[PDB]
């Protein structure tokens, strides 16, 4: 009687949704056709006899990815008319997907959301995935969040956004729409998790020893993180954690809800079994700055609160004996007004392996969600990138001619300045 609905918008969102939906189907024993040859109820729904239907909706204005989905092996799984598709792409223009073509599509998506919500009885909250540096992704994510915040109100929404890397970039105009989308979801999303690609590339290179990774390898790690986060809702555990038990433990103030994640262990089968993978060493590896899932240095800032999930055969006393060691270290310092900052969850189900993938099978794993003061650097560098081109009003004509006003750029800049001032104000000791 506990449910959650995941929203996938944009090319990156759909490509990570595919990645998480192989993993969930594999973890619950459901074949790609949707047929089994009481834990499924969190992500799926029973049709009365036979197949299961995911509680997910796919959105995009550009039809190529959806058409690829509707012809692959998973054509029989998803309901045919929840893969909403458009005709014309926003083409990396934020104003397009927020003012011009997204408005005519958003009504169908909201109707689908209502039709899925009326089925659930114990709706925990929503999940949303969107790559920020694109037109349709950021614009439609903003519009959907704004509609949901007023249609439902206090229901919790979680956002797994992928911000651009510090120096590596695929587009040339992504700072503009990244800043605008951050403006939009700052006052509209309860949790936002950092996911830039460069850090995960470094993780793959160093640990998985892959020298030529593709997007699928990144999306599989993200899917594993999602599964670790939501395992506690569908498996028995000695110390459970619910989604609604987050803003009471990781969010000191309503404005501050951007945090960065990490995962451990990450290791290949060729050298995994030569070492014992004790809980102490994995919880040490999870706190290593080089294993952050976002390219930010935690040594440059304080910690505010750490929520970290275990799964497997871990014993609570071993967890406490390792939290003490971390509190001992002099290179990791917490904020003054937080004496204890750890929330611990323990689950029994070990992580599942996907055949043909990178990760091996292990009995212990740890996933941490940590809120730290050091996150302000990404905001500062994105702001610096934005200012350089906004000084000469470059690329603005592509946005003014799509219905957006001239002054809309300035207030996003002011909100980022306010956020940066707030992060500095919080981190000073009393």
């Amino acid at each position: 009687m506990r449910e959650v609905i995941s929203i996938h918008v944009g090319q990156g969102g759909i490509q990570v949704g595919n990645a998480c939906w192989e993993l969930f189907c594999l973890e619950h024993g459901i074949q790609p056709d949707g047929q089994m040859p009481d834990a499924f109820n969190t992500f799926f729904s029973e049709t009365g006899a036979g197949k299961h239907v995911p509680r997910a909706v796919f959105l995009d204005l550009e039809p190529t990815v959806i058409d690829e989905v509707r012809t692959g092996t998973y054509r029989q799984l998803f309901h045919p008319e929840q893969l909403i598709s458009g005709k014309e792409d926003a083409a990396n223009n934020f104003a397009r997907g927020h003012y011009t073509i997204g408005k005519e599509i958003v009504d169908l998506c909201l109707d689908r959301i209502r039709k899925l919500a009326d089925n659930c009885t114990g709706l925990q909250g929503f999940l949303v995935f969107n790559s920020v540096g694109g037109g349709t992704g950021s614009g439609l994510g903003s519009l959907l969040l704004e509609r949901l915040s007023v249609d439902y109100g206090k229901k919790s929404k979680l956002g797994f956004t992928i911000y651009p890397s510090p120096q590596v970039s695929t587009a040339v105009v992504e700072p503009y729409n990244s800043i605008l989308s951050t403006h939009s979801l700052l006052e509209h999303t309860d949790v936002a998790v950092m996911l830039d690609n460069e850090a995960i590339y470094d993780i793959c290179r160093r640990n998985l020893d892959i020298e030529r990774p593709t997007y699928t390898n990144l999306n599989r790690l993200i899917a594993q993180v999602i599964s670790s986060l939501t395992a506690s809702l569908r498996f028995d555990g000695a110390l459970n954690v619910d989604i609604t038990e987050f803003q009471t433990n990781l969010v000191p103030y309503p404005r501050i809800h951007f945090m960065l994640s990490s995962y451990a262990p990450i290791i290949s089968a060729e050298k995994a079994y030569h070492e014992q993978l004790s809980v102490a060493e994995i919880t040490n590896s999870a706190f290593e700055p080089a294993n952050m899932m976002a390219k930010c240095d935690p040594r440059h800032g304080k910690y505010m609160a750490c929520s970290m999930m275990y799964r497997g055969d871990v014993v609570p006393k071993d967890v406490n004996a390792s939290i003490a060691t971390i509190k001992t270290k002099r290179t990791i310092q917490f904020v003054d007004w937080c004496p204890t900052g750890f929330k611990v969850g323990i689950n029994y189900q070990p992580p599942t392996v996907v055949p043909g993938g990178d990760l091996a099978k292990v009995m212990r794993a740890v996933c941490m969600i940590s809120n730290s003061t050091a996150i302000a650097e990404v905001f500062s560098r994105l702001d610096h990138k934005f200012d350089l081109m906004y000084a000469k009003r470059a690329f603005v004509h592509w946005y003014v001619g799509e219905g957006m006003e001239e002054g809309e750029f300035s207030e996003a800049r002011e909100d980022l300045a306010a956020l940066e001032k707030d992060y500095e104000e919080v981190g000073i000791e009393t």
Binding site: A305, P316, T430
Partner: protein, 430 residues
Amino acid sequence: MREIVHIQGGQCGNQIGAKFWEVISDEHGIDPTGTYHGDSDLQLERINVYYNEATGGRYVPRAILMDLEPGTMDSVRAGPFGQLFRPDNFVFGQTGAGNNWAKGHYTEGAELIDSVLDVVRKEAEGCDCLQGFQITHSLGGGTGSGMGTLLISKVREEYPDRIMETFSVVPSPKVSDTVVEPYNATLSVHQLVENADECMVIDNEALYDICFRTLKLTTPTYGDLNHLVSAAMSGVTCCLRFPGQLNSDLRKLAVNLIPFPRLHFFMIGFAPLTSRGSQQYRALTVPELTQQMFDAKNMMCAADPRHGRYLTASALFRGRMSTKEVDEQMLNVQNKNSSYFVEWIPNNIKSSICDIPPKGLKMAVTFVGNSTAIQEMFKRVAEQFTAMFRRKAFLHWYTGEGMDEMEFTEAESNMNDLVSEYQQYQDATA
């Protein structure tokens, strides 16, 4: 006659009860199907204390299980001895509290509590002669620490002359699993002192310390901590269910261990406890039991009892033994430690003997002592509370559901006043 009903709330309380009832059933020879298969006549004479009688000759506990989420009770039913509980007594909500005290005490816990109070009233009105209630809950969680404490006040308002027990697990700063523990601990201690007739604090840190040092088992789990807590719980009411040289119900302990109505926070311990490999070396004698009973590491709390002076003490011996030896040993443990016993109340140790030992053991002792050393726990809890509250961290979650900071200030002031007036008698001299 003089029976009590069981009420438990939250996940921690449900897990404690899931072992307490197993221990009681094994003691009385009740199979997991509710059928008596015991050996001794005394096993059935006073079974009305905890068990009711239904048609078909089977027995059903008079326990009431409540939580704001259905998962824990849906899991405890599938465990051993899970079928004994009457399905009608299961009451649950569909939302949960998310470790937020305000949600579990003002908004959600207020509407649901009518249904559980209905079944509580049904159970109490029916029974032959009420002795009282015993409550198991945790102070580290939102729904538990809120709904349980509000239920305490509601029960006290309707049965002012009955006795009330509470076994409360307080969050230790060593093993912290939730970041918002100080807030709902401090809020709960405020209400708990006003209504509970007896309170018994239990700490996970002390349980881990005991398991690692005395039993010396490699991998402690929640099952061992629950088993120790269950043995301690059963030891208190043993003489009320079995004959003995000096019977002593709960009210007699209440008279003899509480000097002033606001000083009713005890710490307990169980003896004997020996490792598997050393269970053959040791010989069970009254001196061996009493030397381990007053041992500082044997207390179920991290509080150090030689950092203060005992106001009073109690011991509940089990098994057949001579009373002269018990009295002389109690005198000896009080003459050799005169510095740690308050001097203006002479003969401050109570003893009782029950002729029925635990199954598998020939002698056992349960220790309940009211000491001034408990101040250290409230000191550290208030220290963390005032470290976190001065910045108003995580305060918006509580203030968004009708609560204000004034109730936080009053709670802090009352808790500090309790801390001060509890140590006031430590320095008092005759």
